[PDB]
Amino acid sequence: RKCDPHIGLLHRGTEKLIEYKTYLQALPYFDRLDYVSMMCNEQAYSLAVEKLLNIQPPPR
Amino acid sequence: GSDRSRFLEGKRAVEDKNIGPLVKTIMTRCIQCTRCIRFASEIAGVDDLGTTGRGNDMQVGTYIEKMFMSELSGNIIDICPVGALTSKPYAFTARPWETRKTESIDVMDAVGSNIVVSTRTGEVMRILPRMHEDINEEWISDKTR
Amino acid sequence: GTSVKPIFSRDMNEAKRRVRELYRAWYREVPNTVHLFQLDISVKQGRDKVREMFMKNAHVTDPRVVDLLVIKGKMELEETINVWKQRTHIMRFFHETEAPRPTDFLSKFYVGHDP
Amino acid sequence: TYKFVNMREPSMDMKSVTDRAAQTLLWTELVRGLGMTLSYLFREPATINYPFEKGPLSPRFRGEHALRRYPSGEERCIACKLCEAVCPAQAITIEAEPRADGSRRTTRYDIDMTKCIYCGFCQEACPVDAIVEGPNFEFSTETHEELLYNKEKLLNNGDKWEAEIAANIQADYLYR
Amino acid sequence: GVRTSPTGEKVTHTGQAYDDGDYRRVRFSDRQKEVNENFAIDLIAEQPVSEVGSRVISCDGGGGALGHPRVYINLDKETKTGTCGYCGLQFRQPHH
Amino acid sequence: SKVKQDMPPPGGYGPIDYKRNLPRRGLSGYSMFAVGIGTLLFGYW
Amino acid sequence: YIRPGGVHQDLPLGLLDDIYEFSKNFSFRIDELEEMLTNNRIWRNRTVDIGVVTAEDALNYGFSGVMLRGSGIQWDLRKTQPYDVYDQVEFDVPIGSRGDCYDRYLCRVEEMRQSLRIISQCLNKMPPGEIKVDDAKVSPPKRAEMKTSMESLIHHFKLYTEGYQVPPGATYTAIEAPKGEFGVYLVSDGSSRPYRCKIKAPGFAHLAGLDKMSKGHMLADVVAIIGTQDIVFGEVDR
Amino acid sequence: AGLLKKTTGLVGLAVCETPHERLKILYTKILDVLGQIPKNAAYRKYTEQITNEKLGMVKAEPDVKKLEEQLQGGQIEEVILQAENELSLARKMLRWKPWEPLVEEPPANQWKWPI
Amino acid sequence: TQDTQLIAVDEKLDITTLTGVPEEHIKTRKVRIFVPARNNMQSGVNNTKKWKMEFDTRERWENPLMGWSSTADPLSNLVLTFSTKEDAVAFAEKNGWSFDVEERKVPKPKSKSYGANFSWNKRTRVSTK
Amino acid sequence: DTRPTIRPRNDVVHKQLSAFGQYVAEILPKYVQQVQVSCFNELEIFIHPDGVIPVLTFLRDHTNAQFKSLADLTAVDVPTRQNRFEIVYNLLSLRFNSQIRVKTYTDELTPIESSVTVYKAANWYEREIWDMFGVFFANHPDLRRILTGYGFEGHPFRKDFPLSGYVELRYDDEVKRVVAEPVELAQEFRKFDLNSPWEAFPAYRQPPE
Amino acid sequence: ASATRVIQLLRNWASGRDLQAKLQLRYQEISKRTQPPPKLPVGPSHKLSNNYYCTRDGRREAMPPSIVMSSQEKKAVTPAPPIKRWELSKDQPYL
Numbered sequence A: 001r002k003c004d005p006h007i008g009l010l011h012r013g014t015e016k017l018i019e020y021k022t023y024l025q026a027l028p029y030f031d032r033l034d035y036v037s038m039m040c041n042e043q044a045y046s047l048a049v050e051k052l053l054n055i056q057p058p059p060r
Numbered sequence B: 001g002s003d004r005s006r007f008l009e010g011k012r013a014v015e016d017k018n019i020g021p022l023v024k025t026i027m028t029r030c031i032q033c034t035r036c037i038r039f040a041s042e043i044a045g046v047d048d049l050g051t052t053g054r055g056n057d058m059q060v061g062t063y064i065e066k067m068f069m070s071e072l073s074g075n076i077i078d079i080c081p082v083g084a085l086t087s088k089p090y091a092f093t094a095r096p097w098e099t100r101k102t103e104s105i106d107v108m109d110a111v112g113s114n115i116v117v118s119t120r121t122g123e124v125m126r127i128l129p130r131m132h133e134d135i136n137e138e139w140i141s142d143k144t145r
Numbered sequence C: 001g002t003s004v005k006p007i008f009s010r011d012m013n014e015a016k017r018r019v020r021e022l023y024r025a026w027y028r029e030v031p032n033t034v035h036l037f038q039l040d041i042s043v044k045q046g047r048d049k050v051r052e053m054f055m056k057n058a059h060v061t062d063p064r065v066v067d068l069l070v071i072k073g074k075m076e077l078e079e080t081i082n083v084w085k086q087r088t089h090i091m092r093f094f095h096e097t098e099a100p101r102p103t104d105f106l107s108k109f110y111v112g113h114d115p
Numbered sequence D: 001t002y003k004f005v006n007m008r009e010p011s012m013d014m015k016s017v018t019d020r021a022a023q024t025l026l027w028t029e030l031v032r033g034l035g036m037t038l039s040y041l042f043r044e045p046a047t048i049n050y051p052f053e054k055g056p057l058s059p060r061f062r063g064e065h066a067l068r069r070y071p072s073g074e075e076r077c078i079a080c081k082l083c084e085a086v087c088p089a090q091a092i093t094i095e096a097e098p099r100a101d102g103s104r105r106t107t108r109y110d111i112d113m114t115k116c117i118y119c120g121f122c123q124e125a126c127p128v129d130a131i132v133e134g135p136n137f138e139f140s141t142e143t144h145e146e147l148l149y150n151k152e153k154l155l156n157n158g159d160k161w162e163a164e165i166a167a168n169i170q171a172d173y174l175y176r
Numbered sequence E: 001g002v003r004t005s006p007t008g009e010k011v012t013h014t015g016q017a018y019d020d021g022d023y024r025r026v027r028f029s030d031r032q033k034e035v036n037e038n039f040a041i042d043l044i045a046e047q048p049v050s051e052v053g054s055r056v057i058s059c060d061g062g063g064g065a066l067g068h069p070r071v072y073i074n075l076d077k078e079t080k081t082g083t084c085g086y087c088g089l090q091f092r093q094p095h096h
Numbered sequence F: 001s002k003v004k005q006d007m008p009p010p011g012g013y014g015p016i017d018y019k020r021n022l023p024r025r026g027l028s029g030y031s032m033f034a035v036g037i038g039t040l041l042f043g044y045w
Numbered sequence G: 001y002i003r004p005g006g007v008h009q010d011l012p013l014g015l016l017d018d019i020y021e022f023s024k025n026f027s028f029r030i031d032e033l034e035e036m037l038t039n040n041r042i043w044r045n046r047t048v049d050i051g052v053v054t055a056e057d058a059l060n061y062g063f064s065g066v067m068l069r070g071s072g073i074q075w076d077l078r079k080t081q082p083y084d085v086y087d088q089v090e091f092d093v094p095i096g097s098r099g100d101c102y103d104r105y106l107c108r109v110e111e112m113r114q115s116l117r118i119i120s121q122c123l124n125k126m127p128p129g130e131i132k133v134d135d136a137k138v139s140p141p142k143r144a145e146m147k148t149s150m151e152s153l154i155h156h157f158k159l160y161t162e163g164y165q166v167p168p169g170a171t172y173t174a175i176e177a178p179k180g181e182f183g184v185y186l187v188s189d190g191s192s193r194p195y196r197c198k199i200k201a202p203g204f205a206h207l208a209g210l211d212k213m214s215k216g217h218m219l220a221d222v223v224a225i226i227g228t229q230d231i232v233f234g235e236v237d238r
Numbered sequence H: 001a002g003l004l005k006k007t008t009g010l011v012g013l014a015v016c017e018t019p020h021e022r023l024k025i026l027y028t029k030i031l032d033v034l035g036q037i038p039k040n041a042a043y044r045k046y047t048e049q050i051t052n053e054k055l056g057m058v059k060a061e062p063d064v065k066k067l068e069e070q071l072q073g074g075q076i077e078e079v080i081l082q083a084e085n086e087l088s089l090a091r092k093m094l095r096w097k098p099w100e101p102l103v104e105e106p107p108a109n110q111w112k113w114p115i
Numbered sequence I: 001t002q003d004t005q006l007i008a009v010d011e012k013l014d015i016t017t018l019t020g021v022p023e024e025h026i027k028t029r030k031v032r033i034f035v036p037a038r039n040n041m042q043s044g045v046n047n048t049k050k051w052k053m054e055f056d057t058r059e060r061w062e063n064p065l066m067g068w069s070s071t072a073d074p075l076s077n078l079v080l081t082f083s084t085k086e087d088a089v090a091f092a093e094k095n096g097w098s099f100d101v102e103e104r105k106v107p108k109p110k111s112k113s114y115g116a117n118f119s120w121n122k123r124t125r126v127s128t129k
Numbered sequence J: 001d002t003r004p005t006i007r008p009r010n011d012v013v014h015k016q017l018s019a020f021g022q023y024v025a026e027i028l029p030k031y032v033q034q035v036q037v038s039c040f041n042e043l044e045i046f047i048h049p050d051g052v053i054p055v056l057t058f059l060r061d062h063t064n065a066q067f068k069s070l071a072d073l074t075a076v077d078v079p080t081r082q083n084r085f086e087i088v089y090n091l092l093s094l095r096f097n098s099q100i101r102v103k104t105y106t107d108e109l110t111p112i113e114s115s116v117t118v119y120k121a122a123n124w125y126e127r128e129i130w131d132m133f134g135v136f137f138a139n140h141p142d143l144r145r146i147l148t149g150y151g152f153e154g155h156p157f158r159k160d161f162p163l164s165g166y167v168e169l170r171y172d173d174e175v176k177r178v179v180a181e182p183v184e185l186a187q188e189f190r191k192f193d194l195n196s197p198w199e200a201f202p203a204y205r206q207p208p209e
Numbered sequence K: 001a002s003a004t005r006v007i008q009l010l011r012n013w014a015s016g017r018d019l020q021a022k023l024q025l026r027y028q029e030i031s032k033r034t035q036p037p038p039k040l041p042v043g044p045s046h047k048l049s050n051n052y053y054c055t056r057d058g059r060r061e062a063m064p065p066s067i068v069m070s071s072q073e074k075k076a077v078t079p080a081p082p083i084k085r086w087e088l089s090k091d092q093p094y095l
Ligand code: SF4
Pocket: B029, B030, B031, B032, B033, B034, B035, B036, B037, B060, B079, B080, B081, B082, B084, B085
């Protein structure tokens, strides 16, 4: 009838520790966010940081 | 500044000079801003620092062996924008990005110069001057440093 | 400027009313926690702790604050009711493993460099 | 461009419906499911014989941290603290002090394996290739304290795996 | 070289040895004090000082990219031998 | 010298199959029912 | 590996060949999985019409990725808002039909096949060039250049000690992650460290809608449903 | 019109057998509800414009597919759905009435995020 | 503005009971509002433009096993930034933390002149270049 | 290309987003305080906190907006501001393939109307902002902690909250229980003061005050 | 760690496909684990002239966000032109 999910049983303070680390230092956090799809998380973070920096990666 | 170099030749190297047990000198890092010379001439009074030669070989030092001994000598460590002049007691002890800075007041003399104690791992590492423009400008004595 | 939005109550009396009914719920609940959660502290030994928790923040006077802790206490009651807190979570209120701390200045001076 | 993954209406010819009823009564796709597993049992298993057989690796593999040293014998580390300043987990503790000779070397270089994330950022940050991630990965310990590496333990690892680590860097330094 | 303190504890290259009246030595009994016998302080000493025939010389530590950043040492003082700040190798002008 | 890096062969890699290849096999429904009924009849006799 | 400014280091020599060899045979494994699950009357009974979600309900519930594609909603960030070089590869999005568990599973298998096609295209179209942006202030210089030149050494030191200062501002960038639309709201302040990095997680929204899906469904259907989301609590709990 | 589509694609969206009439009545309802909004308000102007154009396109084209292409709002059923949504939005915006000037200037530098 | 029977709550704002801070760490601490002094090692003033709030340093002992800097003060590495002094003190009073604000020191405007280096009557004439 | 490293700049998207920003500003002048388009073509609308329910609904229902997916709802805490909490709504329009940002402000003790009625996806998001920051959302179906442990005391994502918290956990055999104790780290977090004292970007140079 | 011909027919028939052509075990087709040294190329900014960082700067050409309205007939507009309906895949329209 009702199914309340009690998430937080694995809540690491990722978004809090990210502030205390530099952008390069915060890169391995996203690899540890979703552990079945990994390079996609790094790709998202890299696209965000590149867009903020107004730079583009080489075509290769 | 740029992000690369177009210098494809051999760099220069300058023999180090000794000026006492407080200021370690690696003169090959000197950019010859002559700020130490002006500080010694005006703020410290003693005219023992200067230049030698011309061109790329003109080196900043004392020529003859003579320690830069003054109550305000260690301040040249602050004056040098590069690592040419460095604090000998602090040499190879800590990195700037890791020391916690706590502002305090010197108690050695009675002027009461404002200082910054940089401590890491609960241990005092060095004393730097803090600008006040009334007490100590931005200098401290050697007994304070 | 001096006048700002309210949370739930529009005066201190209504906030005290909400505090009163929250205490009502907690006081009625306590023995159910003692039995259901298989606690070993006496029933009174939990009711007085509810009283002490209510008396802790008895100094606040901003109404919006009072509604805020009313909601927070309601949430803690909600967790306690449908076994969302566990034995360890409830027992945290009675700080058991914590060694008693001293209050006089002399013992603090004897023990370490702290205020 | 998009495709409809499930938009197939079954044909209602007498043959089609007879085949569907035969599949229902005489379980057909179920027999196909049995046949697939029969085909793979008769196939070769993929298990390797550990520890007599080891899964393949690459020269870039990140494992047990180790401090290298120059061929002369002097340690490569100069206590520039780049590795400590770049570790995402703050697993490196460095204390430096000018040695008797005069060279600046770490009086303490501890790396906490229980806090390390094995990113390899330290080995990139090192300007003298002093700290590396060795090829070793079978270094499990029975007690926690054995995973808190000291300078001496890291130097022992460098002296032990030097033959492997030198070759691994030799086969990868050109990519970096 | 690694030597033995009066208690029995081997001193490391950093001059570390627990005091006799120190409880911490309890950790080392039934175990060993992990120390590195190959002392960098000694190992760099017997490396021969190269007789460089130029006023200044460039050291990269050997191996190019395998070594340390290339630095130039000024060999002008006849009373001392120029020592690379990265690897510790010494150099000296041919008797000036 | 020239630059060297991991590259596809000069003519490019071969074709890569991606479509579903679930093969079709087995007799028709009529044939399956006929075989079952014939087996039943033989057993009955 | 993937880092702001490109990638850490280039591919080891002889890796494209191995990827081609693997992707050549991966189609057989996909077909075997299909033959194992697609037409089975047991799987086609525990996943057909089990966990149906409406199109507007899915859109309002914050769903993304497969749970949109699985319910007729024609949306895919790889095509609608292409990022990187996704506007070059050719692929088809497996739009679902009924929105149940079986339709989403079929969608996932077809996404596997289409991604195999994209892998073939990427292998056949690898261009020459470098691996990181040719800017030593956002990407560390090569180790060979660092040990030889002043500026490379200084930039390497500062990047690995301080980092690249990101201009002040805030952005929300999202990509079609294999789960859904994984995004980041990155808020900088002009320093070398982020001010606030919020993570938009498809798993969060999908698990928020678990109760709406499981209505009248039994416990076994709930076991199927928390699987059709591919729920991962590393991403959910942030 | 033409042959009716079997399904609309997106689930839940049932195929509507009376697209033209439904769209016409919804657009007329939207216009009449807008009539209550004061003319100076931008909501009235913009929504009346959009509804007028789309009503004209609905009236002109009798072909369902050509009308779908012309409206550029996906399939027709999506168009009735969004017309209902706009009608409800206008009904609620009658109550909200955002035509009034800004309620309150933000306190000093709430924006300006170099900090 | 806000038409919901907008109530006067003149008494000063206090969230000391809504932050979760324990008993010990809310009055025995002393925050410090100050503009950080320029690092005399460098010559850049970009780090002396934002006020900062910090907490008093507490005991920092050595870990018996390895020698780390063990501490038991949660509010030791937490330093807030503020655009203006008034906002920082508003935050300090709002959270019920004792403060001691130091005014922002500013370098006094000097009077530079190249000609004074080569003066004819004054003592500012330099003896070297 | 002349800019092989500089990210390409699109100006048509900038014009379209600016036009829609003016459109939204004219549509709802009651709540829209300030609209701006970033250099990387992202539009942000700063509204009064009372306009949370109306503006969103407009962006969800208008034919010219059709933002029917709450991608993300988050908050940013800036202590130096009066109303420190800054709630951010990210919306995506699948019909016009466009992303919009609606950002409002709120202090510690001011409630915000829950957007659960408009965006039913917000229901969980709101709880997170309540749990992480403490912003109370009125008219919410159920507000509760969603990430922190049961009985947690505080809002972790607040800036005035140590990253190590105040309480750690342990197992005590005397009480045979997972007890909570004051935090005491073996190695304290080494706070690195890495910030160049030289101005980085002349463009974002705050005028002196 | 090759099956006999009799077995291969049983595996092939039980599966209905040629398994020997496409196996999931890598025998010798893999790339050699030892490879010749690579020579990585240079980027587009490895020039000895006309390489001033002012032109190549990416971070310093990012202006602050442009405000279009602040609190201190005209045809209705849209965030972007409406999406265009996707077309069926000519490769394989219906699965
Ligand atoms: S202050 Fe330093 S850099 Fe300047 S001249 Fe003196 S030694 Fe050289």
